[PDB]
Design a binder for this molecule. Sequence first.
Ligand SMILES: Nc1ncnc2c1ncn2[C@@H]1O[C@H](COP(=O)(O)OP(=O)(O)O)[C@@H](O)[C@H]1O
Ligand SMILES: [Mg+2]
Length: 647
Amino acid sequence: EDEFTPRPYQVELLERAMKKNTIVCLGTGSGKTFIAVMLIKELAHEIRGPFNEGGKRTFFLVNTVPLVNQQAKVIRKHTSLKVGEYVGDMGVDSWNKEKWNQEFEKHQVLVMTAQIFLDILNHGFISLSQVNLLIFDECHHAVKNHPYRQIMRHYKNLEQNDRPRILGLTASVINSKCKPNQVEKKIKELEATLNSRVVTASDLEEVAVQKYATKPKEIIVSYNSDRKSDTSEVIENIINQALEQLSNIEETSNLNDTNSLKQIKKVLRDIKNILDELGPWCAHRVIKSRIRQLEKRESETAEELRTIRELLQSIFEQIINVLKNLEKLQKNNSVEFVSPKVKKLLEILKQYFSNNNNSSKELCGIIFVERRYTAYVLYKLLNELSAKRDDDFSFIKCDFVVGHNSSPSSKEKSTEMNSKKQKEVLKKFRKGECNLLVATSVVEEGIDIPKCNLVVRFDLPKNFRSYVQSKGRARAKNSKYIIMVEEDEKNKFQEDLNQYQEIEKILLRLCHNRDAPSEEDFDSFEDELLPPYMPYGTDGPRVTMSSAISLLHRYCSKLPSDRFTTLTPKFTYIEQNNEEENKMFRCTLRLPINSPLREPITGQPMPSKKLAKRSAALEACKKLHEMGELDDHLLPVKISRKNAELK
RNA sequence: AUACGUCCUGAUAGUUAGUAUCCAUCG
RNA sequence: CGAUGGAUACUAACUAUCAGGACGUAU
Ligand SMILES: Nc1ncnc2c1ncn2[C@@H]1O[C@H](COP(=O)(O)OP(=O)(O)O)[C@@H](O)[C@H]1O
Ligand SMILES: [Mg+2]
């Protein structure tokens, strides 16, 4: 076992955390996870008690899916306490009370995402008085209507005697771009919501964490996009003519599904965009993928859509015919036809490789792109370049990771991803078999990465926190930070960089010597304009306007009907103005035919339409529970045919 | 010539509504 | 394939500030 040795600032922070509820602000790579580990290990005596006798339990909450495994492995390795792991893949929602009781009895420490915790707490399956300790990972995401805020709202009503301690872990404080003056208001709202005092040790400010923390060097690379191959510009003109023709077709010719031709035009301008950003070959690859999808679709299509698809097929035929003239890949010159920006990226990678060839240290690099499909086509492109056998591309290993949206029905998505495959790719990267990674914002936040030397930003950062975490993604010594900037964008980029640097400076200076939060601010905010539905009182399960729409949609999904069609409530909106002439909104909905209740349900009026939908949802839920379909714990019941006949 | 008040236009900051796109969870 | 959450961009409205134009009053 590792045989860790405590450091003075670690114990200094631990004593303060034990004394009072606090929020930890530390630089990246410092080891706040170990602070949480030690704090958990110190208070392990209470967890030994049985659940039936009131023995409390300690929870851990995290944002995304891979972090669930990441933190759980650390907590299992460094402690003898038993831990449990649950995520939404195994369909934990369809369980009943007894199974949850057994799971709670088995495990002492539980780690899950926020939504599952909220779903469990709302249905009355657990009592907040049984929580020993709760840990907030990435405590800067608790804003507006985030699930963290709803869990806090649940926490507020509990009596102070049995309230558990609250501890916060973060690397960034402000979620978005803020004015230098508004930073105080943002941090005040944060510490008012969490009901804890953010702390900063005098030790971490001086030399202590400075040696352990790392800072990269920043490089600004300018590029121009107006210049492009003359043939490529000819192709863009051709697609402009084609889109004009398609728009004329849409305007002149009636369409049974105008959204279908809109989809044709929009996938077209997507293809034009890929040509602009990447080049003709990648555009043709997307074109052949789309023609494969067209072959899939042509099995079941009507005459008009198939005709316009045939015309667009002729357009791709013309595009490929023109591409045959400039088949530079067949001429073994792949550099020429690609976009200049990709050329600049290739040149930068060549410079890095020429620098590191003498270095015995191996290569490790991360690439950030906004769009999943863009990352996929980029991965294909670098894979092909490596397959080209050329010297500067032979050593390149490329992989991609994106968010997963598993479909129970077929409804196939072109992108390929699986949670098991996700963890396999992650461990493959950790072993070091892959050096270059192209990823979206899934891995951008908080997840530890192996020793990396280079981080390159394909796209510009969007807010302060994204810039901070992307800078902190590099952990090894002598790291590199590179951002590409368009020629006309450099002034705004520089001014935003100055704003970010001054924001970081004032954040560092302001965090020291701040007074404890005021509970008057904690009970000050109130957004719930209506009380929830409490049939059995405080103990029994409740339903809040936030979850009522999801409840109705889930129950409608559970209705016995055809697989092809989905029963969806029809929403009718009524606008009215009172004697005050303010904008009042009121909603009304109708259940499908499978509902025993047929009369439309209406709700109270209020200025916003979303609240009108929520009010109608809550009224419908209360009426449906009154009818008797919903069970004791207010969850939708799969009323089988035998169940319907018996009732 | 100035200040105040009212109206209009333009810009900035905040709030609200709508629209579009993207990402992440829930199924 | 639906919902929720977040981010960005656009539009519209309201509030506040500034600038400019017009009118009334006072100095
Ligand atoms: N006493 C210790 N023994 C072993 N490793 C340590 C010790 N203290 C810090 N570390 C290392 O420091 C790193 C801290 O990173 P992490 O645990 O992800 O949290 P954070 O990113 O908040 O610093 C860990 O990877 C851990 O290996
Ligand atoms: Mg971290």
